[PDB]
Amino acid sequence: FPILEKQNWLIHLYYIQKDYEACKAVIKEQLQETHGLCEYAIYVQALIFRLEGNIQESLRLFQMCAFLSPQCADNLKQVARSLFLLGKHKAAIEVYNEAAKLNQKDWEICHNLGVCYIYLKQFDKAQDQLHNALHLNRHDLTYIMLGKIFLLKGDLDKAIEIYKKAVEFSPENTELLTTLGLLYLQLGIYQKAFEHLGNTLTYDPTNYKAILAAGSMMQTHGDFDVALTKYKVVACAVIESPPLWNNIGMCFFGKKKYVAAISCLKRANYLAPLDWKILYNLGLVHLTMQQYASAFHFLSAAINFQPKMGELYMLLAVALTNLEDSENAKRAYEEAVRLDKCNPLVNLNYAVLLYNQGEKRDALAQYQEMEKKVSSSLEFDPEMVEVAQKL
Amino acid sequence: LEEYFELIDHHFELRINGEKLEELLSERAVQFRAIQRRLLTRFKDKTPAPLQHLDTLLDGTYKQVIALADAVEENQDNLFQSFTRLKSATHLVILLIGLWQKLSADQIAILEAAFLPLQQDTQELGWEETVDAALSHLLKTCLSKSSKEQALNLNSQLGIPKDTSQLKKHITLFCDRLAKGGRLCLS
Amino acid sequence: RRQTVITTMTTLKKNLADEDAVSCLVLGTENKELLVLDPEAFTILAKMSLPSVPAFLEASGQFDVEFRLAAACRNGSIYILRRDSKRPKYCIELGAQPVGLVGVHKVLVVGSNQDSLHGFTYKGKRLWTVQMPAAILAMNLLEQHSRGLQAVMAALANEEVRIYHDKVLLNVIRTPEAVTSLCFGRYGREDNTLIMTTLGGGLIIKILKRTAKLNVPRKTRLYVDQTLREREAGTAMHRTFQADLYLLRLRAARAYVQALESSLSPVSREPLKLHAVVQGLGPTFKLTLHLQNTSTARPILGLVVCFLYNEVLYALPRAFFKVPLLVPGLNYPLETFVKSLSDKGISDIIKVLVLREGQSTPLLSAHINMPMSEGL
Amino acid sequence: SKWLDSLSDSMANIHTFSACLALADFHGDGEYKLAMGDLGPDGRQPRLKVLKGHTLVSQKPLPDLP
Amino acid sequence: ILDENAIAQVPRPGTSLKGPSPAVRPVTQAGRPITGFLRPSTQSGRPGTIEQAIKTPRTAYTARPIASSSGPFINLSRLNLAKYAQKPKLAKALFEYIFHHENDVKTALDLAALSTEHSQYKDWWWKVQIGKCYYRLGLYREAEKQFKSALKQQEMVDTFLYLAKVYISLDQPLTALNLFKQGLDKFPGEVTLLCGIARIYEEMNNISSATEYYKEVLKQDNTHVEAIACIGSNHFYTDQPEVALRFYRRLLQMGVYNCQLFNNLGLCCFYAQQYDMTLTSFERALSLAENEEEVADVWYNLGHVAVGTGDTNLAHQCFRLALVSNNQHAEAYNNLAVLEMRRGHVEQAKALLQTASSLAPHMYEPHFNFATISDKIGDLQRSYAAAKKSEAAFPDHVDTQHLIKQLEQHFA
Amino acid sequence: MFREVLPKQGQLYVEDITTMVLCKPKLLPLKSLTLEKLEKMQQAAQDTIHQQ
């Protein structure tokens, strides 16, 4: 006969100030007095459990709260969310459906159905559900999940529009700006990428995920010292990260500091022995340093990690040409020219190998293949014309 | 399914009593160790001093520890007897299920594997958790078509439960979904 | 009957809005309803329907002609109530449950559970957001009419209180303990009193004065000599390393085939994984075999474990036993009690074979070097 | 140093909230008191306490938590 | 655990015994990176409770498996020690026999007491022997008394090292260091004293002085296996494998012929980029290994060489052989699970990472990888329970922090 | 007399992706002389026990 929810306000005020100690005591007292049926000493207790690592007792207590209020869309939403926090997404979908047939006007059900169908690789239903989630109430996370769908399924041609429309409003989210800048890097545009990365860096100066891409873009267009300073900005925050040290080694390899680049690249390779980019960089630098015994080793590793590349086999063949193994260089160059489409350096180097082998016959074939493929490198220009005039 | 559940409940009551006896023996052993360390400190010291009846507390704690050890031994014996009787009962129940429906040798072997898992109980794996996991999985992959129940009720773990209601629910549900026409499989 | 409880309560101005005006109550029932009361607290003037239980309330204006009622609910949302609207129809979600609500003459601040403030407009469009270094325990209003300063406060959980105007911080204070409630008004006889209560109790009353480069490694002579040797003798190194790699592949394949023959791999279609742990000194050791089925969804029905020991050194009670139905994903600990029989310390290996019941070749195996006895 | 400190005490068990604590005039004559419905030291004993100056003048029990 | 002798219970961090991060240097406990030159005095951390010490591997806190506490030529119960004590020529050898052969500390102490009273307490040797009897009976202060009284008679390196042991047993590093510097003031260039100073500095884990003192040992000895091994390991792990290769080629030059030395030479040769002498060293190692754990470690390192070369199948075989040879090899489990998830088999990787994290909880890689794969598929509860244990293992990690932030954000 | 031309630009990471880390190569610690002597004296007793 006492009032059922006597102290829901006090429990809510203790839980909302991040106490979780006095709130639990008041929850226990209320439940002991009311013998259950409170529906908010169980709800807040389950939310507290979910705040801790445990997502099992949270699911149990949300089940009890759903049993108490069988027609209450929020309880079904919370139970499906406790499912989705575990690995079960089909059951999460089937509980979100019931939560939707009691409330057809909320964005959370549609956003969560989208993120579930994403984990279930059902992209039509996920895409349509997230379009709905936008139309009900546009949120940043729905935009992010839609961009993720359009990236996984197809091309950036569908993601650039969504990310631009997303950053259009609420443009202070670093994730949206940075992801749109990254997707600009993924395409030919290097200017708007710099624009959005600088927009991010104004808000957060020490953003590691943005500093990395900005330094990459800088390294691409020379001026290695600016990228080196960008990396100095974040070096202490991430002192052991293979990508940072790989980019720093490429910085030091740009300005002819080959030893201080081998150092950084080997350090990054030790912290990630399965990363083909660092292996390719080590092979390239050991080629430039004229060592030709470690270059082959690192390039063969990077081949064994990403075999469907053209430049890898070209560099391995250049390492084999100076290792007194010309037949292996022949077959490696054949692999490369078969596996390369838009890099004439491979063709020119194979023409050089052939002409140095005394053939001069197939060297013309490789020269014609290169000239069909084609344009900026200063030293690939001269050998282009020298192997031409001398053939 | 009803004179069979009482044996399960007797077994589980013995298991819970054993866990309580062991967590009490833990505290008694900790007390004994603390008083023993105090006495060792009094021993290493040169200067004489009253024992302050520390030896009496040690004797009392030792009596408590011996009593609890004997209690745990007797509970282990009772638990073993209950486990053997439960093995006989579940043998009979699998027999009556394989006759009550025209169960072939394959499904009878599956049932014998799921219901007769162990030879005795240990402080890490018991009959309840193992048969519960096996039955939850057999209902998950063969006899259920709703994913909501598959994820809510039909889950499997290997920790000692706090009640036997889930096991009994799963056994009754197994017999039920066999009655409607279900059949067992492995893949 | 099913009554309700009142949780939030503020007042609302009738027509004058001065120090002598008449104010009317506004109650927030636990049932999702807002009761706009009478000047003398006996009859109802209005009943407003809200979609969720309110937690915080803000009343702006005069009730008869221009009232604005902002309600921070438990579902993490601010609902505004205007004239003629029984339902808000202008809602704003915060993403986190609002821990406070203070109304500035034009901007409405909402304190988030994410340790920040969010200034919105009374139409339902956020205009700014500021980040706090720690949690927000209580937000009140600091208003002095001499300088016209009407700024929101913040009782942060990091033992400080910072007064916030539109965007700038000022007059940040410190406290010996984090503070749960702050009030600013004409307490005593001072127009600028601020009284604050510590999370642990106690009171702190403050009177405001009216006169307000990298770690790139180094390389020594050893490195340049080694690189010179590599540059002058790279071909021999390449050839001999390739020969060594060929011989290493040969020997690794040899040992892998020998292990497959003896079936000595504790990890080996037919998915399983077993490893045996030994625990305890003294003549009696606890030997627990952790066995696991590693497959998507396929149980393994007929398996059995057989121990191989030296019957003169170890007394295994049950050196052979069936294993339960192995459900994919669960580690089954199957334990036994090994006991050393030798009066002298002798450590001998114990083999374990997991095998089908219709086959005679072990599915997999494991080894355990039993430690010394420390007997009696 | 804009905030002139007046009183710092730690024995006053005042576990109120930012909404159940309000100051106003309560006997005229331009002397504002501060009335607060304070919970128990834990939340068991609802007690209404009013403050004038910085000494407690009246605390009296309350039916339920304000 | 059951013996408390340190005066201070919670002394200042830096004055009690009770560098490269776990992302580079392998570890044995929550901290305590792996050392060179295992000596039978290594404690390398200590357990908290008897249960934890029992339920862990027997050789995870000592170079040897932990115990519970640390015809015949002559029958000890037949001879009257009061008559052999009169003859010191017999008494000294008889005490050495009783103490080091029969291990009868009580009768040894009886003989030593009668002998010391026969010599009117004027020979430091009997004082040192009584002090040793005490020290292994448990009485440290009663042993420090005799060691001090023996130092007063005649300074010897023996008594200095004995007092160092006594002081380290009472958890007093800064007293042992002052005593060692006093001894070096007596003996200006002793190698054992400098090595004890370096051991104490490494137990306190400030390597920047242990390297200096090991370098002093080198300036004195230059064949010291301890200092050479320690400086070599430190040189290898701080991304300078060529200097470590030199330091280990030194031990190779001095006739040392082990399985550990040759595997070390292989790691150094490969990581210092000397591909001609790399795999033959691993072959000599596999040849010299007198165990099943040494063979497993050599196969583990060969798998590391292979995965650095590419050809993940060879590394797969080497890790599986490391498992075949030592079933409780957690690094092999972790690496084999990484290669499995590289192939695609997620459940195999999950089970193997669970096994690794069950065998070695103090490691951070199995927990981090399990949390990563879980989060990749979902199961944010398991991801949290694993990333939190990762943060418990390597608390200054970076990816673990981002994982925990993302998880705690998903929970609201 | 033509020398093969090598690209002057390496591969640069443009995002940090959480990859499963491997355990690190383990330098087998050497032993002392006392430890070797103790282990050999411990195993010699076993050998004599088995050889009687």
CA distance D56 to D60: 11
- With vertex at residue E127, the alpha carbon angle to CA E122 and CA E132, rounded to the nearest 5 degrees, is 170
Q: How many residues does chain F have?
A: 52
**Residue B37 CA to its chain's centroid (Å):** 35
Residues of A in contact with F26 (CB under 8 A): none
The total number of structural domains that make up chain B? 1
Structure-determination technique? cryo-EM
Q: What residues contact A68, with CB distance under 8 A and at least 6 apart?
A: A37, A39, A42, A75
Segments forming the whole domain that contains residue B56: 1-187
β-pairing, C303-308 vs C349-356, is antiparallel
| Tokens 């700038």 sit on residue | C168
CA distance C267 to E333: 9
Sheet of C303-308, strand order? C320-322, C303-308, C349-356, C364-369
Q: What are phi and psi of C154, to 5 degrees?
A: -160, 120
- With vertex at residue E168, the alpha carbon angle to CA E165 and CA E172, rounded to the nearest 5 degrees, is 140
H/E stretch holding E74 = none
Residues of C in contact with A18 (CB under 8 A): 113, 135, 157
Residues of E in contact with B40 (CB under 8 A): 2
* Alpha helix positions (H), chain B: 5-44, 54-100, 105-115, 127-141, 147-152, 165-179
CA distance C131 to C114: 9
Sequence letter at residue A44: V
Mutation target among C113, C219, C227, C232 for the A interface, most CBs of A within 10 A: C227
Q: What are phi and psi of E349, to 5 degrees?
A: -65, -40
CA distance C295 to chain A (A): 16
Q: What is the DSSP string of E289-357?
A: --SSHHHHHHHHHHHHHHHHHS-HHHHHHHHHHHHHH-SS-HHHHHHHHHHHHHHT-HHHHHHHHHHHH
Choose among C171, C181, C212: nearest Cβ to D17.
C181
Long-range contacts of A218-224, Cβ-Cβ distance < 8 Å, separation of 24 or more: A219/A247, A219/A250, A219/A251, A219/A254, A219/F12, A220/A190, A220/F9, A220/F12, A221/A190, A222/A254, A224/A251, A224/A252, A224/A254, A224/A255
CB atoms inside a 10 Å sphere around CB E78: 6
CA distance E92 to E107: 13
| Chains F+B touching (3+ CB pairs under 8 Å) | no
CA distance B125 to B117: 10
Declared resolution, Å? 3.5
Q: What's the Cα-to-Cα distance from A285 to each of A264, A292, F6, rounded to whole Å?
A: 12, 10, 10
- Partners of C102 in beta bridges: C109
E120: tokens are: 């009117």
CA distance A236 to A307: 35
CA distance C288 to A151: 48
Q: How many residues does chain D have?
A: 66
Judge contact between C12 and C24, C-beta under 8 A: yes
Residues of A in contact with C3 (CB under 8 A): 3
Q: What residues contact C312, with CB distance under 8 A and at least 6 apart?
A: C341, C342
Cα–Cα nearest to E125, from E165, E98, E102, E93: E93
Residues of E in contact with C294 (CB under 8 A): 347-348, 350-351
A7: tokens are: 């102290």
E100: tokens are: 């080091």
CA distance B118 to B90: 12
CA distance C226 to C232: 10
Q: What's the Cα-to-Cα distance from E254 to each of A171, E223, F28, rounded to whole Å?
A: 68, 7, 18
H/E stretch holding E176 = helix E173-186
| Domain spans in chain C, listed from the N-terminal domain onward | 4-212, 213-268, 269-376
CB-side neighbour CA atoms (13 Å) of C69:
36
Answer whether B151 touches C (CB < 8 Å): no
CA distance C351 to chain E (A): 12
Answer whether A91 touches B (CB < 8 Å): yes
Residues of E in contact with C217 (CB under 8 A): 238-240
Judge contact between C165 and C151, C-beta under 8 A: yes
Judge contact between E255 and C224, C-beta under 8 A: no
Give SS3 for A124.
Answer: helix
CA distance E291 to B89: 50
Judge contact between C26 and C54, C-beta under 8 A: no
Q: What is the DSSP string of E285-308?
A: HHHH--SSHHHHHHHHHHHHHHHH
CB atoms inside a 10 Å sphere around CB E34: 17
Q: What is the DSSP string of E200-248?
A: HHHHTT-HHHHHHHHHHHHHH-S--HHHHHHHHHHHHHTT-HHHHHHHH
Sheet of D55-61, strand order? D21-25, D32-38, D47-52, D55-61
Sequence letter at residue B183: R
Q: How many residues does chain A have?
A: 391
Q: Is the sign of the CA dihedral C55, C61, C63, C67 positive or negative?
A: negative
Residues of E in contact with A304 (CB under 8 A): 309-312
CB-side neighbour CA atoms (13 Å) of C17:
12
Mutation target among E309, E324, E343, E357 for the C interface, most CBs of C within 10 A: E324
From chain C residues 76-135, the ones with a CB under 8 A of any chain E CB are 96, 113
In the 8-state DSSP scheme, what is residue A199? H
CB atoms inside a 10 Å sphere around CB D12: 18
Choose among A266, A273, A304: nearest Cβ to E311.
A304
Burial of C322 (0-12, 13-18, 19+ CB in 10 A): middle
E327: tokens are: 């079933």
Sequence letter at residue E159: T
**Neighbours, chain E (3 or more CB pairs < 8 A):** A, B, C, F
Q: What are phi and psi of A293, to 5 degrees?
A: -110, -35
CA distance E118 to C42: 107
Residues of E in contact with F36 (CB under 8 A): none
Q: How many helices (H) and strands (E) does chain F have?
A: 1, 0
From chain E residues 241-300, the ones with a CB under 8 A of any chain C CB are 242-243, 246, 272-276, 278-280, 282-283, 292
| Chains E+A touching (3+ CB pairs under 8 Å) | yes
Q: What is the DSSP string of A13-26?
A: HHHHTT--SHHHHH
- Partners of C27 in beta bridges: C9, C35
From chain C residues 335-364, the ones with a CB under 8 A of any chain E CB are none
CB-side neighbour CA atoms (13 Å) of A19:
23
Judge contact between A65 and A36, C-beta under 8 A: no
Q: Is the sign of the CA dihedral C315, C319, C321, C323 positive or negative?
A: positive
- With vertex at residue E338, the alpha carbon angle to CA E397 and CA E356, rounded to the nearest 5 degrees, is 75
CA distance B153 to B137: 11
Cα–Cα nearest to C364, from C281, C300, C275, C279: C275
C162: tokens are: 């910072």
A236: tokens are: 């202490």
**Residue A252 CA to its chain's centroid (Å):** 25
Q: What's the Cα-to-Cα distance from A128 to each of A111, A113, A142, C64, C302, rounded to whole Å?
A: 10, 10, 12, 46, 47
Give SS3 for D57.
Answer: strand
CB atoms inside a 10 Å sphere around CB E251: 22
Furthest-apart CA pair in chain B: how many Å?
A: 84
In the 8-state DSSP scheme, what is residue E33? B
CA distance A81 to A92: 7
**HEC states along chain C?**
CCCCCEEEEEEEECCCCCCCCCEEEEEEECCCEEEEECCCCCCEEEEEECCCCEEEEEEEEECCCEEEEEEEECCCEEEEECCCCCCCCCEEECCCCEEEEEECCCEEEEEECCCEEEEEECCCCEEEEEECCCCEEECCEEEECCCCEEEECCEECCCEEEEECCCCEEEEEECCCCEEEEEEECCECCCCEEEEEECCEEEEEEEECCCCCCCCCCCCHHHHHHHHHHHHCHHHHHHHHHHHHHHHHHHHHHHHHHHHHHCCCCCCCCCCEEEEEEECCCCEEEEEEEEECCCCCCCECCEEEEEECCCCCECCCCCEEECCCECCCCEEEEEEEEEECCCCCCCCEEEEEEEECCCCCCCEEEEEECCCCCCC
| CA-atom Rg of chain F in angstroms | 28
CA distance B58 to chain C (A): 25
Interface contacts C/E by beta carbons within 8 Å: 110
Cα–Cα nearest to E113, from E134, E93, E97: E134
CA distance C154 to C141: 9
Residue environment code for E151-160, b if the CB has 16+ CB neighbours within 10 A, otherwise e? beeebbeebb
Task: Quote the crossing angle between the two packed helices E399-410 and E380-393, to the nearest 10°.
Answer: 150
Closest chain B residue by Cα to residue C301: B113
Q: What's the Cα-to-Cα distance from C338 to each of C282, C309, C373, E320, rounded to whole Å?
A: 11, 10, 11, 28
Cα–Cα nearest to A275, from E338, E289, C30, D17: E338
Cα–Cα nearest to A205, from A249, A174, A168: A174
Answer whether F46 touches E (CB < 8 Å): no
| Tokens 């002409």 sit on residue | A355
CB atoms inside a 10 Å sphere around CB E75: 9
Give SS3 for D7.
Answer: strand
Give SS3 for D32.
Answer: strand
CA distance C91 to E225: 75
A26 and D65 in contact by Cβ < 8 A? no
In the 8-state DSSP scheme, what is residue F23? P
Closest chain B residue by Cα to residue C302: B113
Choose among A238, A267, A305: nearest Cβ to E239.
A267
E305: tokens are: 């060489």
E363 and F25 in contact by Cβ < 8 A? no
Judge contact between E400 and E394, C-beta under 8 A: yes
A252: tokens are: 């030091």
- Partners of C136 in beta bridges: C156
CA distance F23 to chain A (A): 10
Judge contact between E342 and E374, C-beta under 8 A: no
CA distance A208 to C141: 38
Q: What are phi and psi of F44, to 5 degrees?
A: -65, -35
Residues of B in contact with E49 (CB under 8 A): none
CA distance A87 to A90: 9
H/E stretch holding A386 = helix A380-389
CA distance C59 to C71: 9
* Alpha helix positions (H), A156-238: 159-168, 174-186, 191-203, 208-220, 224-234
CA distance E334 to E340: 10
CA distance B110 to B184: 8
CA distance A285 to A258: 7
Judge contact between E340 and E309, C-beta under 8 A: no
In the 8-state DSSP scheme, what is residue F5? P
Residues of C in contact with B118 (CB under 8 A): 324
In the 8-state DSSP scheme, what is residue B160? -
| CA-atom Rg of chain A in angstroms | 30
B59: tokens are: 């004797």
A288: tokens are: 């430039």
Answer whether C178 touches A (CB < 8 Å): no
Q: What residues contact C39, with CB distance under 8 A and at least 6 apart?
A: C14, C22, C23, C24
CA distance E164 to D22: 69
- Partners of C129 in beta bridges: C118
From chain B residues 126-155, the ones with a CB under 8 A of any chain A CB are 146-148, 150-152
E173: tokens are: 């590093």
